Amino acid sequence: AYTNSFTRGVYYPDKVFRSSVLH
Amino acid sequence: YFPLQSYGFQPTNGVGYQPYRVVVLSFELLHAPATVCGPKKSTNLVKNK
């Protein structure tokens, strides 16, 4: 069986907080 | 062959062949909360200055 990983799999690449930004 | 082989450590061996004990301390620098710190003390906190 197969399925579509729509948009999942994104994880915080760093343990540093950020806000309102496109990194 | 057996992948391991024994060192020959005799007291009369040359210093190059004498046994040395090695310890490697590995630490990752500041990216998250910490639990190993130095002997530095602390102080109160003041705001608006």
Side-chain angles (χ1 to χ4, degrees):
Chain A
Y2 296 85
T3 174
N4 191 15
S5 67
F6 300 92
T7 51
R8 297 181 184 280
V10 182
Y11 57 98
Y12 295 82
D14 292 327
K15 314 185 73 59
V16 172
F17 175 96
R18 300 184 180 87
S19 172
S20 297
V21 55
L22 316 180
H23 178 77
Chain B
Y1 305 128
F2 194 82
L4 313 185
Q5 191 159 262
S6 306
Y7 286 105
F9 288 145
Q10 314 179 30
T12 57
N13 290 8
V15 72
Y17 290 83
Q18 288 179 11
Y20 277 82
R21 282 179 182 198
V22 177
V23 170
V24 180
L25 293 179
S26 299
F27 57 88
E28 176 53 294
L29 251 296
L30 265 294
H31 57 56
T35 63
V36 185
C37 293
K40 190 63 176 299
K41 292 188 176 182
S42 300
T43 307
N44 294 341
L45 188 134
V46 51
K47 308 175 180 179
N48 309 26
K49 285 182 261 207

